[PDB]
Amino acid sequence: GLIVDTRDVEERVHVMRKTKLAPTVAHGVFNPEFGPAALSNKDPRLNEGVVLDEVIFSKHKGDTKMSAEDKALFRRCAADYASRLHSVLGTANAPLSIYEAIKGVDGLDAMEPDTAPGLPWALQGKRRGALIDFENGTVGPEVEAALKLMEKREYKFACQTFLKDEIRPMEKVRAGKTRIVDVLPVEHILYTRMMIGRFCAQMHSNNGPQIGSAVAANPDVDWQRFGTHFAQYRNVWDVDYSAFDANHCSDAMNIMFEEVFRTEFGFHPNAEWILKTLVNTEHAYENKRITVEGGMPSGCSATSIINTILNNIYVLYALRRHYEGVELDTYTMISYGDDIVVASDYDLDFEALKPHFKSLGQTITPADKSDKGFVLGHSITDVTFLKRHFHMDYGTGFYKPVMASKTLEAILSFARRGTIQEKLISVAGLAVHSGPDEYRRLFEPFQGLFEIPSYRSLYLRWVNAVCGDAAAALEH
RNA sequence: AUGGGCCC
RNA sequence: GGGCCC
Ligand SMILES: [Mg+2]
Numbered sequence: 001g002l003i004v005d006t007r008d009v010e011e012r013v014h015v016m017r018k019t020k021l022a023p024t025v026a027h028g029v030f031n032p033e034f035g036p037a038a039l040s041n042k043d044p045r046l047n048e049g050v051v052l053d054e055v056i057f058s059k060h061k062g063d064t065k066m067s068a069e070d071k072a073l074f075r076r077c078a079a080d081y082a083s084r085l086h087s088v089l090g091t092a093n094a095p096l097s098i099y100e101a102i103k104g105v106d107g108l109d110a111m112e113p114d115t116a117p118g119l120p121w122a123l124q125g126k127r128r129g130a131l132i133d134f135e136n137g138t139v140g141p142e143v144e145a146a147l148k149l150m151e152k153r154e155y156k157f158a159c160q161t162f163l164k165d166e167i168r169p170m171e172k173v174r175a176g177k178t179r180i181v182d183v184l185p186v187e188h189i190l191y192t193r194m195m196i197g198r199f200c201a202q203m204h205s206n207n208g209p210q211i212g213s214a215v216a217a218n219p220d221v222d223w224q225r226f227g228t229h230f231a232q233y234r235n236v237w238d239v240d241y242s243a244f245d246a247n248h249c250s251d252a253m254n255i256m257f258e259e260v261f262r263t264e265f266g267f268h269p270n271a272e273w274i275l276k277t278l279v280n281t282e283h284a285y286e287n288k289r290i291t292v293e294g295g296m297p298s299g300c301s302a303t304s305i306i307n308t309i310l311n312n313i314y315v316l317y318a319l320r321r322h323y324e325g326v327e328l329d330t331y332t333m334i335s336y337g338d339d340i341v342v343a344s345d346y347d348l349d350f351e352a353l354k355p356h357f358k359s360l361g362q363t364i365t366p367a368d369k370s371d372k373g374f375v376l377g378h379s380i381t382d383v384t385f386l387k388r389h390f391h392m393d394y395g396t397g398f399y400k401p402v403m404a405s406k407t408l409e410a411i412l413s414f415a416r417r418g419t420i421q422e423k424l425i426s427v428a429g430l431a432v433h434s435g436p437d438e439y440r441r442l443f444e445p446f447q448g449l450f451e452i453p454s455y456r457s458l459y460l461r462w463v464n465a466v467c468g469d470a471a472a473a474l475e476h
Numbered sequence: 477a478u479g480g481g482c483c484c
Numbered sequence: 485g486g487g488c489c490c
Contacts, residue, residue, distance in 0.1 A: 299478035
């Protein structure tokens with residue numbers, strides 16, 4: 001988006017500047033060029049002459065403004081994709097009762113009780129359980145007024161900025177581009193789920209190529225489904241965006257809300273309204289207070305679904321701007337926020353589509369950086385989705401999600417205080433698809449110290465998950 | 477460190 | 485309550 005006023009207020013918000021990630025026994029062996037993100041502005045590992053506040057907000061390179069013809073095309077693409085969307089899901093997108101938004105429904109999980117509450121609650125020294133009691137599922141006095149203050153449409157707020165204590169490649173760590181988190185107020189998350197929660201739950205359960213969404217998908221079972229679909233098309237593309245969320249232009253966000261969440265399809269009038277509050281946000285970061293126009297806050301309700309919807313609309317908009325006679329039938333795709341896979345039997349020139357994406361403020365790039373161009377003839381066994389490759393299991397011929405060994409080495413090389421044993425359990429379910437030799441090698445530093453599940457136990461569990469008949473048939 | 481997922 | 489993905 002576009003930063004419009006950086007302000008210095010007397011009050012200051014504290015930011016976590018101490019990594020909980022510590023090296024493990026595996027770090028000494030694997031020597032990964034990965035490390036914890038720089039949280040302090042006086043971090044020794046930073047390259048000299050790098051201010052952390054400067055690098056963080058560098059993702060806002062302006063807010064692209066569209067012409068009326070570009071907006072009328074985007075409005076048609078939003079209306080066409082919304083027609084397909086609400087035709088698969090149905091139009092049962094009525095509001096949600098107050099405690100349905102808290103305890104969830106079929107497809108939508110419950111809210112997290114012990115996560116940061118946002119502003120202005122955090123500035124009092126307040127946990128989230130004080131405002132909303134989650135055991136019963138009711139709100140307290142502060143949220144009482146805000147809920148109906150949102151109904152009045154008077155509700156103003158601000159996003160609390162947070163540093164993401166995660167593992168990053170050492171080039172990004174020394175460059176100081178630590179990723180941030182825009183924490184919205186808890187009452188805003190509650191009210192958003194009331195307006196569009198039933199829509200989100202219906203998307204979760206209906207994920208797949210038909211709606212172009214992979215949100216709420218389980219790669220262990222869903223990759224035989226996705227893999228066989230994209231293996232049916234001549235050309236496959238692995239497109240990468242740069243700052244996909246920050247570069248959503250105001251016009252594209254506003255037009256998408258006006259077309260997807262219409263009261264025609266069953267939503268409440270405030271569904272369009274509450275989503276439009278995300279366009280022009282105020283952000284608090286210690287002394288600073290930053291007003292921004294455009295971009296999506298990375299930390300709000302339905303932020304993955306909104307990004308997934310925009311991603312689907314961007315492809316339809318770009319193709320129609322360059323070619324003639326293009327519909328949703330022309331191509332197939334599936335996305336999970338910025339991550340996207342596209343395919344078509346037509347010979348689509350994606351190099352030619354780069355400027356048409358640039359009119360939306362987005363910059364597309366081939367994930368396979370070699371040659372530095374979108375070539376044709378790639379298959380599903382070339383591309384990556386959700387940090388996993390589509391490889392066919394040699395034993396049962398099913399597609400399985402395989403992660404690169406150096407990605408698993410980075411994951412295994414760091415861990416928080418005493419969370420190692422169950423992290424080894426969780427990661428082993430990911431490492432099983434790298435094969436028996438690679439699985440034993442990834443956990444060799446740990447054996448004799450921790451419990452390591454057998455490759456046999458995890459492979460059998462996966463066979464039953466992808467298809468319980470596959471386990472039974474192998475028995476007869 | 478958030479929103480939402482998926483596994484335990 | 486922990487891990488992983490976006
Ligand atoms: Mg990608």
